[PDB]
Design an enzyme around this catalytic site. Structure first.
Site, PDB file in Angstrom:
ATOM      1  N   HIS B  39       0.873  -1.193  -0.059  1.00 54.85           N
ATOM      2  CA  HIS B  39      -0.098   0.287  -0.004  1.00 54.85           C
ATOM      3  C   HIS B  39       0.738   1.240   0.158  1.00 54.85           C
ATOM      4  CE1 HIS B  39       0.265  -0.123   4.651  1.00 54.85           C
ATOM      5  NE2 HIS B  39       0.545   1.233   4.310  1.00 54.85           N
ATOM      6  N   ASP B  88      -0.089  -7.565   1.528  1.00 53.99           N
ATOM      7  CA  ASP B  88       0.441  -6.412   1.543  1.00 53.99           C
ATOM      8  C   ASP B  88       1.891  -6.141   1.767  1.00 53.99           C
ATOM      9  OD1 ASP B  88       0.615  -3.450   1.749  1.00 53.99           O
ATOM     10  OD2 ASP B  88      -0.367  -3.431   3.710  1.00 53.99           O
ATOM     11  N   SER B 189       3.748   2.800   8.400  1.00 50.86           N
ATOM     12  CA  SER B 189       3.556   1.858   7.467  1.00 50.86           C
ATOM     13  C   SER B 189       5.118   1.337   6.627  1.00 50.86           C
ATOM     14  CB  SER B 189       2.682   2.371   6.316  1.00 50.86           C
ATOM     15  OG  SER B 189       1.387   2.041   6.680  1.00 50.86           O
TER      16      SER B 189
END
Lengths: 83, 242, 35
Positions: B39, B88, B189
């Site tokens: 992502h 992911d 992230s």
């Protein structure tokens, strides 16, 4: 007059030494590659290369490619074990 | 990071900052690859600019970093940007090898029996420059030690209304405390959730910071991380096929 | 701090979210949107 492999190329994160004699690059001469200690390990071979009849510096397994100096992973300054 | 403390030099030498329209992270592998979340690198496929990858510093806004650039980005084929958080994971090939030093060193990939160091209640460590309880990005690299959560406890928590069901898969792991507090947050992230192999005394990556509640550190939820051990053949085939 | 359609995957600026069953909550990715 004899086969000459020429001065060998350098090894990134490593070093090369002439074993047979200083600047000796001709048939059957021997060089030794090594990787920088502790933080790298050499992967593909033992780094002893010989000036082959075909005119290439050649590893003990017959490879013409350089060794690879691979960084040692997972080293950290963090204290462990509750210290 | 919520509930953490400042990293010291050399604690997380794999940590990289990936700076663009977003602030996000990755982890160095070998000397020429970065592991991150899919992502985090999706939106950049059609950008003119390579990813701006920054290594070797604790300060987010360090002028003193080691610069790297993407050459290629590999997003897992099973990642579906518009349909949930499964798969992911992404690999970035850097344009050149970085020289290793005390502040720049790759994380190890999980071995076959790494799960022995990733049992329920075993402590993993998330690091990053993301949101802290000051309410801003961290100036300083932070870290937090958090336990691996039982997969069915985690799944059950994210089934409790109003959370959206079916979000947590077998390719995810959860870490954190039932009470909340300690967590990875916006800006974290792509960072590696790391574990110690106490036989080798070397650190490996078990998770990638992926998702959680919109409100980090909330009780009744846990940070969710991509379960890296499930991707070892994919990783290996990308770094070979290259 | 959010309003959305139950079950859908939607963008909250730079992040991807899945909306909760109440339409007033979500779970999202952990990017910091500089904008």
């Amino acid at each position: 007059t004899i086969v000459d492999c020429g001065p060998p190329d350098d090894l990134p994160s490593g070093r090369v030494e002439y074993i047979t004699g200083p600047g000796v690059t001709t048939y059957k001469a021997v060089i030794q590659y090594s990787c920088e200690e502790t933080f790298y390990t050499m992967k593909v071979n033992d780094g002893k290369y010989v000036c082959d009849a075909d005119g290439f510096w050649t590893s003990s397994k017959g490879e013409k490619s350089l060794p690879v100096c691979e960084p040692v992973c997972g080293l950290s300054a963090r204290t462990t074990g509750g210290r | 990071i919520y509930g953490g403390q400042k990293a010291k030099p050399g604690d997380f030498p794999w940590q990289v900052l990936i700076l663009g329209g977003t602030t996000a992270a990755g982890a160095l592998l070998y000397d020429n690859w970065v592991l991150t979340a899919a992502h985090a690198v999706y939106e950049q496929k059609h950008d003119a600019s390579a990813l701006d990858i920054r290594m070797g510093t604790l300060k987010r806004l360090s002028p003193h970093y080691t610069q790297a650039w993407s050459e290629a980005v590999f997003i897992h084929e099973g990642y579906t940007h518009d349909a949930g958080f499964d798969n992911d994971i992404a690999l970035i090939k850097l344009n050149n090898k970085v020289v290793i030093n005390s502040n720049i060193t790759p994380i190890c990939l999980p071995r076959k029996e790494a799960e022995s160091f990733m049992r329920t209640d075993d402590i993993g460590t998330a690091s990053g420059w993301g949101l802290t309880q000051r309410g801003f990005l961290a100036r300083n690299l932070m870290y937090v030690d958090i336990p691996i959560v039982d997969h069915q406890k985690c799944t059950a928590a994210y089934e409790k209304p109003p959370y959206p069901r079916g979000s947590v898969t077998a390719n995810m792991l959860c870490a954190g405390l039932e009470s909340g507090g300690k967590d990875s947050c916006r800006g974290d992230s792509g960072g590696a959730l790391v574990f110690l192999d106490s036989e080798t005394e070397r650190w490996f990556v078990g998770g990638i910071v992926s998702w959680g509640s919109m409100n980090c550190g909330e009780a009744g939820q846990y940070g969710v991380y991509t379960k890296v051990i499930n991707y070892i053949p994919w990783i290996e085939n990308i770094i070979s096929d290259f | 701090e959010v309003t959305c359609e139950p079950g859908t995957t939607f963008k909250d600026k730079c992040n991807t979210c899945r909306c909760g069953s109440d339409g007033k909550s979500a779970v999202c990715t952990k990017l910091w949107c500089n904008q």
